[PDB]
Design a binder for these strands. Structure first.
Lengths: 349, 350, 349, 350
DNA sequence: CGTTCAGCTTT
DNA sequence: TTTATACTAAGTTGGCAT
DNA sequence: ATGCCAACTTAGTATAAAAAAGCTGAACG
DNA sequence: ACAGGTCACTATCAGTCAAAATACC
DNA sequence: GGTATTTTGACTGATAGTGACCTGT
DNA sequence: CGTTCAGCTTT
DNA sequence: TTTATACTAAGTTGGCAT
DNA sequence: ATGCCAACTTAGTATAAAAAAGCTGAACG
DNA sequence: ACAGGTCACTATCAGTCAAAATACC
DNA sequence: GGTATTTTGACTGATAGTGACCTGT
């Protein structure tokens, strides 16, 4: 040749210049102006080294006014702190944000793409953390909605994302399985078995269980104000689960002598238990039982459903619903769900 | 002014450094020394902003029917509301929210009023814990803007993108024991206060309606009430009796006609009709005087109606409570029936 | 002076030229270029004569591609014809369109303003035809939505309009009033009284009433398939309205002898009646009764509500609801509405 | 090419008439003879269109990750659906709708695909009365577009602005008398058809599940069915009996094991399991052979389940019908319970 | 005692 | 025929530190 | 034995604009 | 010594307003 | 006579170039 | 008799 | 506390024409 | 007497995407 | 006679593609 | 040797000026 043509740039028969993106291999037309052609090509080949943009003035102006992701997330945390949400709730959010920080760059909100967000989320889905994905997506979407209401963005680049599937893996618990575990929990601290009984017979959540004080029992009724919902109920000490042969009263007595503390359930040192701990030992006794389940094993919380289902058949739907504290039927008809374990025997009633 | 091919918005520095100046912010931007490139991008940026510079006075015939100011508009919006045909009280609620807007936003051209600005104001209210207000102000702001859009003074409603602040009712409920206790503190107060309290609980009516019951509204064992708030028309049988508080509607009425003596069932010492505000106010006096303590905001006279509902719900029937209160479907009831965290659900083995 | 300055155009101290709209009185800046200034002013003063635009090329291009209101409405009628709607329904729509044709110009859809639409609607509201306004608005909005789904517009300039108030003026009918009318209907053709009885006792709509054939009564049940809803019911001839002393059976007998035709209700010539006619004579007997009502008087249709309300108290809510054919409770709880006439006596039940 | 200050898109005629030519339509526009004015407006119009002409190959780095074609995309969209983890049948339903799209739209760049075009296709289906299809095709089209937006191949979903066509079910219901009549025509058909018909009515199960009941699914007076469609798991008591049709589940099963003899309760003459399509098909044969006439579309084998539901609803209970069918809440039931205009509501004096 | 204005929260 | 939605508040269980 | 952080999966609860009141500190007679 | 850009400050923009000038019933 | 509508020019809050002037390196 | 493919309508 | 929404299908009653 | 058009006010009925089937004319052995 | 604009038709756009040329492990 | 990535130029479906040429007046 006889050319200064820089690489990537070709000249055609008429003298028409074209660039060739080497990543796509598709070319681009420049014109006949070799001076301008080369010029642009140089600037294009410099972008191939590193991605530093001779960014237009337009974009520059839109950007230096508008707000950055991580910066918005700092602000966002402040918004939540003000929603009047419970501490745990805030803890959860913080977590999702933390994830968002790891997953997305700190660039102009307006410049985070649906594609980018999508990529992150699938990242969670491919590790099998579909749940986390759904939640993260949610949080991000809400952070965006807020970015919108304070007028930093204008549209929600997430509203466009694949809101993950919601398959529930934890297996339900059958009465028999309960018994087998109950037995395996022989070599476990005394409070476990008791915890377990108290749980099924009251149908309260582990959190609330572990906070029940003897001073909450007045005239044969156990007063409970549920931490998660604020529902307030009085449970008659006179309950009985005929199917498992559990008596609330009898069980309350064993707790009184064997456990003795201010809290109905207590440690070997007469001190209150962390709900996690209780959950933990149940798990242990469960492994020690050596039972087999499809997918994920039942957990301590599953005693609630077992309670409800057991009181469903022994007493009534309504009782079960009241004992659990569901103002809504959507929830009650969900604890009534067997999740593939049991066959619904159709009665001619 | 010049000796330059320099397009607008681009200034040259003493060294020959070219920068674009955004006119919206007034902050400038660095380009480099390559005037050819500098101007080039400046033109492109000028196209994004001030596309052109010209406006055929024809374009005057366009942007004309457009230019108006928030306050000059609020002024017009008021008159609109005046023709809407709404009750005096409502209009008052509205006018107030407008006023808040007037003190919260600049009198700029509607078109220039930012979502960001609005939210800023709205958040001002939320941060002072006046969330309730924030909602209503937002609500009204949105309505004004709509109307301006109707008259094509704007194209877009910038309020819409903003969200409504959610706010949990604070006000606490009133338990029978508490009522009794308040009633006791009532002894220093006028005779009518007690009678009002009793009547309020037994009849379950709104204080506004209570204050307007006349003796002529009683016929053949029935107290006729046409509710001022909703237009619901009911007749209450003068035979009711609250068991938990030992109140007799007959007896209470009786005490009323002998002691109070006036054209209205409740009446001032001066034997004249009472304002609903006063009934409330005096009750509030008693409540303080009773020294009770509550979570959140303290119960007010309107809480006597919820107590009423709740007691009747048990003594008689849910169905009854509804009818007494004057609730049309099966929905608004499920609200007065609610005790908002004051009661323990005694589980029966049924 | 020493100027050709055209009218409306002033020159300021620096030599700055301004136009003055004479309708607003606000001025407009042109520049220092007297040649251009005048030029533009001329073109502006010519627009003051008539409104003919030296319309830009931009608008010209957007317009000659896009679609016209009346033209869209012609098309629109075709869309409805295809929705599978009943004839009356179509008749109503046609009407609203006709109104739209009278109310709005035949210009580019994209160029009909919220303001213009608004103006029309208020026009109806000020004549006191609030109802019509609501319906028109509706129709127009739907025509627009359709213009949107076939990609002619992009936004619904109506979604922004004041959807009118919906006050219902027609007064309900009390049993007494029924009686007084029933009596006033002495000098009216025999079929009126009968119509009236049959109506209250069956609770069917006038349309359906006037189409009942003797061949629709099998084994003591009156078979009815309601024209407006397609509901199908069988009414026992054994009904009775104790409050008005009406017997369905007795009434059916009088119709058989005195009226005799294929249709249960018939004219003096033994021929079927147009529902309008029946409505008309009721009205007449109503005037002749000389009763006074607040707002609008009751009409024949109000016998339905009276029927329902009467059967509510005599028999049951459920019966009344079934007899009327309401699958929904929203409707039934609406015929239960007294509309300011009667005081709901609270029973201790 | 020229000797002209003429900007692009503006051509001059032999008389000296200037016109702008819209490049999108290709139709030109008249301006006049005033070249100064002509060009002026042409520039303004050129700014609205092709703002500029330049694209820093930097702008290549932008529009690159953008350009893709409907069919090249449908190709990619397929593979996506393949990873979605859906049942074979579903995927099949989807692939079909894609195919319709492939035959209905040009293989143009996504960005260029108009709402107007889409609707045009969609209306094509509606006008042939295939409304049902129109809905589903629309639905899937929308999903594909979303996915492309996710991969930033487009910015906007042009399907969204389009509406879903509403379509009333045509298919008529099956009355007990009709069933009987069809059963009678069945005599020419295989022995299994009748047995299937009976079993279908008595058990109220989906034909797909019927065909897969094995004799081993019966234990201690109970027929266990895990529904293929929904995963619902039920046990049917082999004691049921439809009164209006004189069917005995025991008897019908009995006839089955003696006559049919195969591993499945219903079985082919060849003593092998039957396809659900065939059961349906043969029923359809009978229906024609019976000579009955109906409004709208004729009843099919799946209509035996509605008959089932309806009869049981009366004979036993609404509650029962639900449980038999396998319906979780209190909602999906209120559908099978519906007779869609086949029955007269006998009014009782209750 | 008891009223009207205002700015907030509740039906 | 089934589910979705937008928040909120847990429960589950692996680890590292006492 | 144990206690507390951290990343994940699961329970729980439900509309939003209009319209109309009701509450209560001030200033006032 | 300089990239990068903030900052007060005039000369003109762009236009409002209230008398003076003048047209219309 | 008596009101309404242009001219006209004094008077005023904005803008956009300007060169002086901060500042992190 | 009985199967799979396809294009439509229904759960 | 009450209402909204998006269609669809009537009923109501004034007139002009038989 | 009446019948049919026309402009108005009132009744009536309710989600929309995913997922999974079921129906039935052809061509085929 | 002309406003207003449609219509086929080249010369170049703008770029794809598959060998030739050449660089990289 | 053996694969991958530039050059290069023949080859191709688009576009935008063009003057000839319809048409309602």
């Amino acid at each position: 040749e006889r050319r200064d043509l820089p690489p990537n740039l070709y000249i055609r028969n008429n003298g028409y210049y074209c660039y060739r993106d080497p990543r796509t291999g598709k070319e681009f037309g420049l014109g006949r102006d070799r001076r301008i052609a080369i010029t642009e090509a140089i600037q294009a080949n410099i972008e191939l080294f590193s991605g530093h943009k001779h960014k237009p003035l337009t974009a520059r102006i839109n950007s230096d006014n508008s707000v950055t992701l991580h910066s918005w997330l700092d602000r966002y945390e402040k918004i939540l702190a003000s929603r009047g949400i419970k501490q745990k709730t805030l803890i959860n959010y913080m977590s999702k944000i933390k994830a968002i920080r790891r997953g997305l760059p700190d660039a102009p909100l307006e410049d985070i793409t649906t594609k980018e967000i999508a990529a992150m989320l699938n990242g969670y889905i491919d590790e099998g953390k579909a749940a986390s994905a759904k939640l993260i997506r949610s949080t991000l979407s809400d952070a965006f909605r807020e970015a919108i209401a304070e007028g930093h963005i204008t549209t929600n680049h997430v509203a466009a994302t694949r809101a993950a599937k919601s398959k529930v893996r934890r297996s339900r618990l059958t009465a028999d399985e309960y018994l087998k575990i109950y037995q395996a929990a022989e070599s476990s601290p005394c409070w476990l078995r008791l915890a377990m009984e108290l749980a099924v017979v009251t149908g309260q959540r582990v959190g609330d269980l572990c906070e029940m004080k003897w001073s909450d029992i007045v005239d044969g009724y156990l007063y409970v104000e549920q931490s998660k919902t604020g529902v307030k109920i009085a449970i008659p000490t006179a309950l009985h689960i005929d199917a498992l042969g559990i008596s609330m009263k009898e069980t309350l007595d064993k707790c009184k002598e064997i456990l003795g503390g201010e809290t109905i359930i207590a440690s070997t040192r007469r001190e209150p238990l962390s709900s996690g701990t209780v959950s933990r030992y149940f798990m242990r006794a469960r492994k020690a039982s050596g039972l087999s389940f499809e997918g994920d094993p039942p957990t301590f919380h599953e005693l609630r459903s077992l309670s409800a289902r057991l009181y469903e058949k022994q007493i009534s739907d309504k009782f079960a619903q009241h004992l659990l504290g569901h103002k809504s039927d959507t929830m009650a008809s969900q604890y009534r769900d067997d999740r593939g374990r049991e066959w619904d025997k159709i009665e001619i009633k």
